[PDB]
Amino acid sequence: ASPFRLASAGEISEVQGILRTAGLLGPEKRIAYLGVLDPARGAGSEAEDRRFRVFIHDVSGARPQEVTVSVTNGTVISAVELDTAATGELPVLEEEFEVVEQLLATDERWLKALAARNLDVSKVRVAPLSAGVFEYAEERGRRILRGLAFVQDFPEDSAWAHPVDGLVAYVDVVSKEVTRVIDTGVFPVPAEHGNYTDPELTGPLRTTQKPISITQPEGPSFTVTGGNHIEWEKWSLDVGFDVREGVVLHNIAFRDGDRLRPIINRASIAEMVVPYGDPSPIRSWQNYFDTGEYLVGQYANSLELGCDCLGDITYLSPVISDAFGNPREIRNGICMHEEDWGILAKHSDLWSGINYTRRNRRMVISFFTTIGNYDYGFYWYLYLDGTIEFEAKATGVVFTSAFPEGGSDNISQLAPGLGAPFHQHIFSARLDMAIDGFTNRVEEEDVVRQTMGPGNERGNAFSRKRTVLTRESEAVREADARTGRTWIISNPESKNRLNEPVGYKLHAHNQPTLLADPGSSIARRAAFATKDLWVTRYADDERYPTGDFVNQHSGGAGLPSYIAQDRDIDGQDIVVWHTFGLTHFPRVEDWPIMPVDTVGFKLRPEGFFDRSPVLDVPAN
Amino acid sequence: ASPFRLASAGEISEVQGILRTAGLLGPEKRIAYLGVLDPARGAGSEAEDRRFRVFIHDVSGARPQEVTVSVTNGTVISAVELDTAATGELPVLEEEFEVVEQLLATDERWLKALAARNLDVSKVRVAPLSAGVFEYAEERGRRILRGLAFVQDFPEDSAWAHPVDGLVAYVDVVSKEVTRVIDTGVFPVPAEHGNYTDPELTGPLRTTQKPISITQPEGPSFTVTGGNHIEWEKWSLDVGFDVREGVVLHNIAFRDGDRLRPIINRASIAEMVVPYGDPSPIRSWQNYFDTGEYLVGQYANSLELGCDCLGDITYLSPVISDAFGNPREIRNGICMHEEDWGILAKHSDLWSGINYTRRNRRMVISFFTTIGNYDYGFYWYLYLDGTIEFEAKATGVVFTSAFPEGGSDNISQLAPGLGAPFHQHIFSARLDMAIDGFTNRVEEEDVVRQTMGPGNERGNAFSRKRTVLTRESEAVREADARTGRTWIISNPESKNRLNEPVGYKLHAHNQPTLLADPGSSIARRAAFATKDLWVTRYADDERYPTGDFVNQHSGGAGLPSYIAQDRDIDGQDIVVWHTFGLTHFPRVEDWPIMPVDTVGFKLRPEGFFDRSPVLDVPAN
Ligand SMILES: [Cu+2]
Ligand SMILES: [Cu+2]
Ligand code: NA
Ligand code: NA
The missing domain is CATH 2.70.98.20 (Copper amine oxidase, catalytic domain)
Structure with missing residues (x-):
């Protein structure tokens, strides 16, 4: 009976169904955040209303939405389009982690940088790092990750032992473009393993x-x-x-x-x-x-x-x-x-x-x-x-x-x-x-x-x-x-x-x-x-x-x-x-x-x- | 073999015997401190010499001594008379704990103070507290404890629940005299038990x-x-x-x-x-x-x-x-x-x-x-x-x-x-x-x-x-x-x-x-x-x-x-x-x-x- 109970698998699937039914969760949509909302203050004799807050990303480039759903009542309480340049980008999606390395692997600037250091691209892992807000005007309203490279000598190797310094890339994970590759010079890639x-x-x-x-x-x-x-x-x-x-x-x-x-x-x-x-x-x-x-x-x-x-x-x-x-x-x-x-x-x-x-x-x-x-x-x-x-x-x-x-x-x-x-x-x-x-x-x-x-x-x-x-x-x-x-x-x-x-x-x-x-x-x-x-x-x-x-x-x-x-x-x-x-x-x-x-x-x-x-x- | 081993019962009895043999531990003497000394620096190939440091108090009022004994060799290395007014009094002896209450129990000033508060002297515990160094010139070179009183309503009662405020006494534990009894006024003795x-x-x-x-x-x-x-x-x-x-x-x-x-x-x-x-x-x-x-x-x-x-x-x-x-x-x-x-x-x-x-x-x-x-x-x-x-x-x-x-x-x-x-x-x-x-x-x-x-x-x-x-x-x-x-x-x-x-x-x-x-x-x-x-x-x-x-x-x-x-x-x-x-x-x-x-x-x-x-x- 507790309004503070953990979300159940059923409630999550029900939120999915409500959003779908409402036209808010078509094939290009992704859930970037979903969580149950706490009961409002007071809420004494009032029957429970389990509500969920959802941030919905669109992989086709459309504006994301913030949505509140009543899973109890099967309704959308509110849905609002977000202007990310103003209010912020949605949280990083797990599916975007791999994208930085994947896009960089066929970028000629990245490959030039790796070749200058005699590094096999198949062995270069790229950490998908949050971008923050700096001086790059073109990033405003775009979902950007920055990538720092680490060499993995074999599948079970700890790549952290082998940072590739002097090199960073910026990537737009929605349009799937590499915006910048910065190479300030070669540094020795540390050789000792950390296994x-x-x-x-x-x-x-x-x-x-x-x-x-x-x-x-x-x-x-x-x-x-x-x-x-x-x-x-x-x-x-x-x-x-x-x-x-x-x-x-x-x-x-x-x-x-x-x-x-x-x-x-x-x-x-x-x-x-x-x-x-x-x-x-x-x-x-x-x-x-x-x-x-x-x-x-x-x-x-x-x-x-x-x-x-x-x-x-x-x-x-x-x-x-x-x-x-x-x-x-x-x-x-x-x-x-x-x-x-x-x-x-x-x-x-x-x-x-x-x-x-x-x-x-x-x-x-x-x-x-x-x-x-x-x-x-x-x-x-x-x-x-x-x-x-x-x-x-x-x-x-x-x-x-x-x-x-x-x-x-x-x-x-x-x-x-x-x-x-x-x-x-x-x-x-x-x-x-x-x-x-x-x-x-x-x-x-x-x-x-x-x-x-x-x-x-x-x-x-x-x-x-x-x-x-x-x-x-x-x-x-x-x-x-x-x-x-x-x-x-x-x-x-x-x-x-x-x-x-x-x-x-x-x-x-x-x-x-x-x-x-x-x-x-x-x-x-x-x-x-x-x-x-x-x-x-x-x-x-x-x-x-x-x-x-x-x-x-x-x-x-x-x-x-x-x-x-x-x-x-x-x-x-x-x-x-x-x-x-x-x-x-x-x-x-x-x-x-x-x-x-x-x-x-x-x-x-x-x-x-x-x-x-x-x-x-x-x-x- | 370790020169850092704990003192044994035998070593302590041996220190006792050496001091006795040396004329330093007659019937009026008390050990206020005894401990093993650490080995000196270097002490490499040199055979071990277990040495003990002893502070000896004299209950008859004679000056105390600081003594170093070699238990290994059965010798007194050094013995020096202490001027306590200059270098400090010896540590409080456990046997002195009871003395404060005992001396106060027949002092007319203490009894007057207890009677003013309607307290049975048989029920008044006195904490034997270190004196420090303040404005009392007569304390210099004397072994003093100060006493604060706590009432114990029955044998198993926690006396700490019942402090007797407004009252303190100072006692010379060697001459067995009460030097001062200070009563600044009656305070209610707190009544709730703390058992x-x-x-x-x-x-x-x-x-x-x-x-x-x-x-x-x-x-x-x-x-x-x-x-x-x-x-x-x-x-x-x-x-x-x-x-x-x-x-x-x-x-x-x-x-x-x-x-x-x-x-x-x-x-x-x-x-x-x-x-x-x-x-x-x-x-x-x-x-x-x-x-x-x-x-x-x-x-x-x-x-x-x-x-x-x-x-x-x-x-x-x-x-x-x-x-x-x-x-x-x-x-x-x-x-x-x-x-x-x-x-x-x-x-x-x-x-x-x-x-x-x-x-x-x-x-x-x-x-x-x-x-x-x-x-x-x-x-x-x-x-x-x-x-x-x-x-x-x-x-x-x-x-x-x-x-x-x-x-x-x-x-x-x-x-x-x-x-x-x-x-x-x-x-x-x-x-x-x-x-x-x-x-x-x-x-x-x-x-x-x-x-x-x-x-x-x-x-x-x-x-x-x-x-x-x-x-x-x-x-x-x-x-x-x-x-x-x-x-x-x-x-x-x-x-x-x-x-x-x-x-x-x-x-x-x-x-x-x-x-x-x-x-x-x-x-x-x-x-x-x-x-x-x-x-x-x-x-x-x-x-x-x-x-x-x-x-x-x-x-x-x-x-x-x-x-x-x-x-x-x-x-x-x-x-x-x-x-x-x-x-x-x-x-x-x-x-x-x-x-x-x-x-x-x-x-x-x-x-x-x-x-x-x-x-x-x-x-x-
Ligand atoms: Cu840290
Ligand atoms: Cu404390
Ligand atoms: Na509060
Ligand atoms: Na040292």
Whole structure:
């Protein structure tokens, strides 16, 4: 019955049928995006209306459409033709990935470039890379991908070991034309292989690892009902999945005594961008919005038992649309399990003689996606004590280049002649807050040092201050690690037993934000990434920090336009957007396959509960 | 045979015998500190000399002594009388804990204070708190403890629920005199109990947690030899234990191919301080140096299987001296186990068709200690990929006070009338570095933003800079989270295959450092805590950031005096001292027993290896 249930294969085929019936999905049409819409606010006694949002591309060059369908009612609610030069191109289609290499393989300029480097065209892979928005006027309103080349010596070879630097091509994937081929000069193609399953490179595999066995003989402590409704150790939520955002959590709530207390209405990673910091013209345009441009959900891995996810695992297998509107299952695409998390609380009291130890656990909801060379794990954690955490795990193969003779300020060396351009991976978490309901506010909390003097004669006092962010113009905030800055989301109308507003505190990692010059194209397109925290008033159409259409789309949409409205956020339905990222200067240890690195954030209860919420956890 | 082996019961009894034989351990003498000394540098072909350092207190009022004994040779190497007014008092003796309450129980001023509050003296516990150094001239050269009172309603009651505010006493624990009783006025003693095993407060215990079983059917992948030498997944180290510092790691090295490569010579938590930020005269003197004043190792818990440490656990049971020089075993005081740590590396490659996943693991070496209300877990982690990490887990019961009518800028409310003064927990990790041997240097690495302009026309470039810290005067550094500041320890004489010095990068959490006014007593006594990173030239007598004697000891010793020497640290035997801490504004959720909170740091290889060191980890 849940209006938050995962999309079924049947609903997707039904959307297909409705669009077909309506004349919107003929043979030249392709689905670039399809997802279920969340229920509107209120929607109390009102019967459910499952609605789907669809972006439809036309391979014949006609304008794309944005369409909303009611699958419940079998109707098209709205359909509007898009002017992509204005509002943005549709997300990259998986079918376009191969097109760059295919078109380049018969282009005389490309072939001349490959011949100058003595490279067999049959061995040259071309990465289909998002184009962004630069100085090329002819690209405006055209679907462009840019291609960087990598040599694959044999079918199972890692092409990333062999970048072809000094060469880039631009391609119109609809008209199927190569617009530009730029060759700035030959660089040596790095020769060492990067084949991490080749015994010559690995050496003899370790025989020293003894097995670890994690089992739950009575099964897991969480229940799954209605397909995706999770109940675990007082927590309640629904696990959604969207082809753009990936795993989305809905209705995160905690059962405190008899009462189900909302905390977060919707949590997602609403954007992620990977800006590169190499000023070479071969790569200076490189910024991958994995979520907005490529749709991370679409590329979610099927996760193998005892390998990707260890322990007693419950899987969800979300269904997505292919390019024609047929359902496609991502088998075992979401892992759900609980795990031990060390000591929760411990005290050995001299005076009472009582020794007390309790163990912690967390519920884990995760998926892993692959886009080209990159592989990212997205992990949501719920802890016994009320803490909510997100962690991203970045791995894969580093994006490579040549390593310049005489070195580089913007590229590190991985292997002889092999470079790795500096870059960042920056995420935006969109947290549609509902601390004890929708009436919320945000305060910025800083530690306050105090001067030795009257009232502080020993010079030991310290304090803190909280500043309420009252309107959206005041709610674009930066980190201040030195002063221990955090942000508290509270409900001014819901007080704990000590008469203080209930709240949750967001703890950031305070990693660097977007490094690009503020006048760059990427600083405008990824404006969200320039500041650590934004707070907006909730609106149904403010979904992504970069707007609905990111591909080849300039500034003009997203967070900077949302906050211009300068809406009241002091005791209102609000949304927190937290920017957090990794800044990567690749090291030799990242090659030939990168060990996981992590980044994230957490929210901890801050006077939400009337005392510790884990007093009822049993011993041992 | 290892000169780094744990002290045996026999060695301790032998030290006792040598001191006795030498006339240094008569009936009025007490051992306040006893520990094995590390081998001197070089000590190659030279036969082993196990030496012990002892601080001897005299209960009759005579001056204490510092003594070094050769247990191998049965000799006293040196014995020197200490002037405590100058160099500091000896650490607090466990036998002195009870003395404060005992002396106060027959003092007429104390009894008057208790009677004014209608408190039964038999029910009043007194915390034996370190005194520090303030304005009281008569305390100089005297062993003083200060006492704060807490009511215990019955034998199993948590006294921390019932602080007696407005009252403090100072006591000379040698002459057995109460020097001062200060009563600033009555406060209500908070009435609610804080008994977290009482069913009335917990409610019915959860029946929802299904078991998690962690087993290793073939046993653990690490070996223990010589009592405390660990070998695990290419790592090699010796696990030491000292009554002051607790678990100390020696000779951390990694077997890279055929060659055992040193990384860290000695790693310890060399100090930890808990400064309180309440300007009330009842607590404004409160700063607990758990390591330096109380000796954290001494209070290490015996850790129960399947409770404190879960999985296939190997224990060490370190031996310490009691006050008379008799050995005392801390049964199961150190836990050692390996655990799964999620995905290590993963890539699913479109072009090669190869899908690759490997799992991570870490070796964990831990102990847990209790000092009064506080309980701290100290965890060292070694990861497959070469990462070394430390984590402290803080739990226990928060130190309480009254909560003032009309509120407080320096105390939070936990329960009706119950306060928790703001405070910090600040650690110093002493890392005697040995990156590929002893010839090391430290660089500070900051991210460098670049301006859009010539050479960076798109405004995307970013870089980094490294500054070598050449002399100790230049090596007192602060965090800069905004610029992603880290510190790299490298060996300028050992290059990787890419001709770059091998190194490790220290990643800090960039939490606030000591908040107290710089003119305070605590800013001088805990000077180390005012800055994030110090680098010194190694010296055998520079062990602690606060010097050898912290108790009632002013500034004058420790890190500020070490660096005045302004020694060369550019390619020399160096020591990194990293300050890191938690700043705690207690929340209602911390009451009546605190969920674990964590802080720490890690070091990751930075061009130490010639490629990923985990290419030889097997599948599944
Ligand atoms: Cu990266
Ligand atoms: Cu604390
Ligand atoms: Na909201
Ligand atoms: Na050293």
